[PDB]
Amino acid sequence: ATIGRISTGSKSLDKLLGGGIETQAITEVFGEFGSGKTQLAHTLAVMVQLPPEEGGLNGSVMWIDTENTFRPERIREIAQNRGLDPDEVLKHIAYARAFNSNHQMLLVQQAEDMIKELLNTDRPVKLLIVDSLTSHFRSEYIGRGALAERQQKLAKHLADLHRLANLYDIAVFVTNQVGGHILAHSATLRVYLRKGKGGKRIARLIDAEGEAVFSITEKGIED
DSSP states (O other), rough: OOOOEEOOOEEEEEHTTTTSSSEEEEEEEETTTTTTHHHHHHHHHHHHHHHGGOOOOEEEEEEEEEEOOOOOOHHHHHHHHHTTOOHHHTEEEEEEEOSSHHHHHHHHHHHHHHHHHHHHHSSOOEEEETTTTTTTHHHTTTTTTTTTHHHHHHHHHHHHHHHHHHHOOOOOEEEEEEOOOOTTTTTTEEEEEEEGGOOOOOEEEEOOOOOOEEEEEETTTEE
């Protein structure tokens, strides 16, 4: 399948991204708390449900929380203040909370089952979000980060995500929080977010371009 794009709601960020976040890719956004990574995640979960003429892909969403950040009320606001029925939007976001790093790894294998069930419907999964993807991998191995187990599991977890992204034409969108944090360096595309002046958020590609600049609004994010 050809690559699909999901618009972020920000023309500036869409341009930095060549059109939007890609299917068949893992896109990692990372920064400090409040850098906009969680706001981007909620915004994409609505935008992907739009048709392509408005930057969506008519898709369903799966959301996996490590740290309780999903806010159905925020989904509702972004849907409402755009042209969308909030009931149909929340109904197409399947949610799960990863309890620990091992349950997290099972939830991805479980997600494949639902991906396959929806594959030949009119709302196939097109977005799979994992917020604070490495959180459990960090907090479970304090005092033993050199144990090869922590690296082996994370690497397998990311390879599972990369497989789902490519096999089923899905945009995988993962966030990580900022110095003991661990990031998804194997991501297809990595984006750094930070707070800027005047309440703005700034995005820069890692490539390891310019910068995009956007606001957190009632429509999620926009220029």
